[PDB]
Ligand binder design. Structure first.
Ligand SMILES: CO[C@]1(C(=O)O)C[C@H](O)[C@@H](NC(=O)CO)[C@H]([C@H](O)[C@H](O)CO)O1
Ligand code: NA
Length: 163
């Protein structure tokens, strides 16, 4: 397709602004992480269906981090954005996406990091204001595609219905 660049392999990269990174994860764990090394350490974790409240250890920026997670859905996987604002602080959970297609997306735009939230097939976007956002390197731990912001409606379609 001429709309979607990829797939590309798990890697560390500094994406251009105004491009969605469409992520295609497999198993539960850390999907993608990125930081500005100032006041924003961001990551997205993935929870399989049917997970009772439990502590799980995630490797975030080379560190074992214990987070209290759950997924009450029996059919949908759960993407959760995690954020800490100081090097020595705690991660809080934001902007969950309950997903049937198991796809996620992230984008750098207007001094923010955008992601998807809600429940498929009616997902919407959300964002996190990020200092010096151009320095933000990301490490994807799964295969990904690239889609221009101009084609955001198609990205939303993929989030909601799959490829
Ligand atoms: C300050 O306000 C904002 C932000 O502009 O960043 C608004 C944004 O909607 C919100 N997004 C969501 O909650 C989910 O997308 C985000 C977030 O709560 C914090 O950045 C977490 O530190 O806060
Ligand atoms: Na989200």
């Amino acid at each position: 397709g001429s709309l979607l660049d990829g797939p590309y392999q798990p890697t560390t990269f500094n994406p251009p602004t105004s491009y969605w990174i469409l992520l295609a994860p497999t198993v539960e764990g850390v999907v993608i992480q990125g930081t500005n090394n100032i006041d924003r350490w961001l990551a997205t974790i993935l929870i399989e269906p049917n997970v009772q409240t439990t502590n799980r250890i995630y490797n975030l920026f080379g560190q074992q981090v214990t987070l209290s997670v759950e997924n009450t859905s029996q059919t949908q996987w759960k993407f959760i954005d995690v954020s800490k604002t100081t090097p020595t602080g705690n991660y809080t959970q934001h902007g969950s996406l309950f997903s049937t297609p198991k796809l996620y997306a992230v984008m750098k735009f207007s001094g923010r990091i955008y992601t998807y939230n809600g429940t498929t097939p009616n997902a919407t976007t959300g964002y996190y204001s990020t200092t010096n956002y151009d320095t933000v390197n990301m490490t994807s731990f799964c295969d990904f595609y690239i889609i221009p912001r101009n084609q955001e409606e198609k990205c939303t379609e993929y989030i909601n219905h799959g490829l």
